[PDB]
């Protein structure tokens, strides 16, 4: 199912607006994010 859907909220100090970034290849966690790399968005 679709438990949650993306919306736009006016305040940005909440915890519901924060996201986690997931790479598409084998990239180290401490490495810098390349400028134009494909990624996956995970809601923290």
């Amino acid at each position: 199912k679709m438990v949650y859907s993306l919306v736009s909220v006016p305040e940005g100090n909440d915890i519901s607006s924060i996201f986690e970034l997931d790479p598409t290849t084998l990239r180290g966690g401490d490495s810098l994010v390349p400028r134009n790399s494909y990624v996956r968005l995970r809601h923290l």
């Binding site: 180290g28 966690g29 401490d30 923290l44």
Partner: protein, 38 residues
């Protein structure tokens, strides 16, 4: 023998950096356990 130093110094460096990456992943795990579970 300086090539042997190449080998031994390289192994020392990789062991040190893997130790550091376990340290960094421990820090990452504790930070996500603290921030993620307030």
């Amino acid at each position: 023998l300086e090539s042997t130093m190449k080998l031994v110094t390289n192994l020392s460096g990789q062991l040190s950096e893997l130790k550091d990456q376990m340290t960094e992943q421990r820090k990452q795990k504790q930070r996500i356990g603290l921030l993620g579970h307030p």
